[PDB]
Amino acid sequence: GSHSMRYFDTAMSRPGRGEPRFISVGYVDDTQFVRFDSDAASPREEPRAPWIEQEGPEYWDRNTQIFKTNTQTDRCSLRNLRGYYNQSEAGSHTLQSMYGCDVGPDGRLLRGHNQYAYDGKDYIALNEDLRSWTAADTAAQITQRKWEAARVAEQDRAYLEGTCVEWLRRYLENGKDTLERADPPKTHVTHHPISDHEATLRCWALGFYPAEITLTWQRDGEDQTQDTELVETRPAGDRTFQKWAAVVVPSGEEQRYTCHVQHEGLPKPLTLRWE
């Protein structure tokens, strides 16, 4: 199918408690494969998936250096952002970054990504053209002008079209037994009386990968979006994910309800009922 490679970076200031912590985690789809944490006793790019361990020391050494430099860059960014917003040196603030590339089944670039948030709010993003920026406010406009002056977009484009896609293709080949394997959900419906009048039907999906899934309840073929309780998709800890959806139904009407499951790992979508 289609695949993505994404780095998720968080830098957070902590006045009075040292320099801002920088953590970067890299993913292919829903699989983490590297981490770097400036708070580690000896910071270095460290493997977090078995298929990346085969890369030699030059991979580790070069990426560690890029991440040590990125730590300094994000600290510079935090200092600059504090000024752009006229903020006190007393408070803690957060800069987050997401960047990487998406490819299709054939490995061709679908699109690239490079965007930032400050204190939880979108700040600046590289547009899909990989040549221009979208700035959220007058502070981000300063960043934009600086990045335009320095032709930053051209460097990001070269990275996203070249290096990112090349490495993602390599990772997918080396990890083909897992990264290219979709595990379908194991599904069941449970039934929990609430009162004499009503019961909960809960539709379960367990053991699936990747995380993307659609779980819905219908009553007489009609979607019950408003009356369905859907928990957020959650990690099991063994690479796979879990989710459930629940509806409260009148006693005796259980067979009018169907749970529908869509997922990449299923030969066909499932239609489940209680029992």
């Binding site: 070069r62 990426n63 990045w147 990001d156």
Partner: peptide, 9 residues
């Protein structure tokens, strides 16, 4: 290398 060089905001 695999990781991206970042630029100061």
């Amino acid at each position: 290398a695999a990781a991206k060089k970042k630029y100061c905001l």
